[PDB]
Design a protein around this ligand. Structure first.
Ligand SMILES: Oc1ccc(F)cc1Nc1nc(-c2ccncc2)cs1
Length: 312
């Protein structure tokens, strides 16, 4: 027996707060959708639910899988995280939030030293998977996705929530690739910041200065460069510890493809100002990116079909 129940977001957050020696079989948590059903107040892997197929990808602090509720047959995603590296922020930051640009959480359930976080599965795959498959993305589609990402950031930032690791691997697409949404709040902060992916990290992060929402903007423009070039910024120019190069080198605007139109290059420049004070906000950048997309003639490229050679 255990303490897994059906309820709302706030009841999950409250319990998650208590998660922060020996290894137990303690089973407890909150399922947020009727599609995931506790059985006699239990929800245990291999008994009531199971993972299958290959991994979906890497999440913060744990692996992500396809899973199925054995009773309802309902399919979703699960990130399994060891209790000692589980951050509460992942289940508190988005409680009471709802946006088309944010992948909804289905709940979380602890099973001894493991915390299983359940989330909607979008069948388009991740933006990171799109890049790998296609080499890189054309300018219009990259702008379109950045726009959508930035809309997600507006929604977060006005609530003083920092996503903390905005990157293609944490953006999910819909089945026709027309919709992108943010996921994985493992590094989220409610405005001590646990830094995300090194290649996407702002100078103020490596400098150890107080971080604000502008960290997400920098990261999102690093993601933009990744979509355009097919690789994370820095990696094609620099060898090892990117920490110091982010802090000391000019911002990676040299990595903007020469083919990009004026306003595309401008937006990326403004999203990549070294001093957060001069860096564009999500509201500002979203507007510029919107103008930028119009000026290249709107979204025209099909989401797949043409492999584009990345930067050598
Ligand atoms: O923080 C989480 C909480 C619950 C989850 F089920 C997943 C995540 N994290 C991530 N999921 C993905 C992903 C999902 C589905 N397909 C491709 C990638 C990338 S990072």
């Amino acid at each position: 027996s255990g303490s897994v129940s059906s309820g709302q977001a706030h009841s999950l957050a409250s319990l998650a707060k208590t998660w922060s020696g020996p290894e137990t079989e303690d089973n407890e948590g909150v399922l947020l959708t009727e599609k995931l059903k506790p059985v006699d107040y239990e929800y245990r892997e291999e008994v009531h639910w199971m993972t299958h197929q290959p991994r979906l990808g890497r999440g913060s602090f744990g692996e992500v899988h396809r899973m199925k509720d054995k009773q309802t047959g309902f399919q979703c995603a699960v990130k399994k995280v060891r209790l000692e590296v589980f951050r509460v922020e992942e289940l508190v930051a988005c409680a009471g939030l709802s946006s088309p640009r944010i992948v909804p959480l289905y709940g979380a359930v602890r099973e001894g030293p493991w915390v299983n976080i359940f989330m909607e599965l979008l069948e388009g795959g991740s933006l990171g998977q799109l890049i790998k498959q296609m080499g890189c993305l054309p300018e219009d589609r990259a702008l379109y996705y950045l726009g959508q990402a930035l809309e997600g950031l507006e929604y977060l930032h006005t609530r003083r929530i920092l996503h903390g690791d905005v990157k293609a691997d944490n953006v999910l697409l819909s089945s026709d690739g027309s919709r992108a949404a943010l996921c994985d709040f493992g590094h989220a902060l409610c405005l001590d910041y646990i830094p995300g992916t090194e290649t996407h990290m702002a100078p103020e992060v490596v400098m150890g200065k107080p971080c604000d929402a502008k960290v997400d903007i920098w990261s999102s423009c690093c993601m933009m460069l990744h979509m355009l070039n097919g690789c994370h910024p820095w990696t094609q120019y620099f060898r090892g510890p990117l920490c110091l190069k982010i802090a000391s080198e000019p911002p990676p605007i040299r990595e903007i493809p020469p083919s990009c139109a004026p306003l595309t290059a401008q937006a990326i420049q403004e999203g990549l100002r070294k001093e957060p004070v001069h860096r564009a906000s999500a509201m500002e950048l979203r507007r510029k990116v919107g103008k930028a997309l119009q000026e290249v003639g709107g979204l025209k490229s099909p989401w797949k079909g043409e492999y584009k050679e990345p930067r050598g």
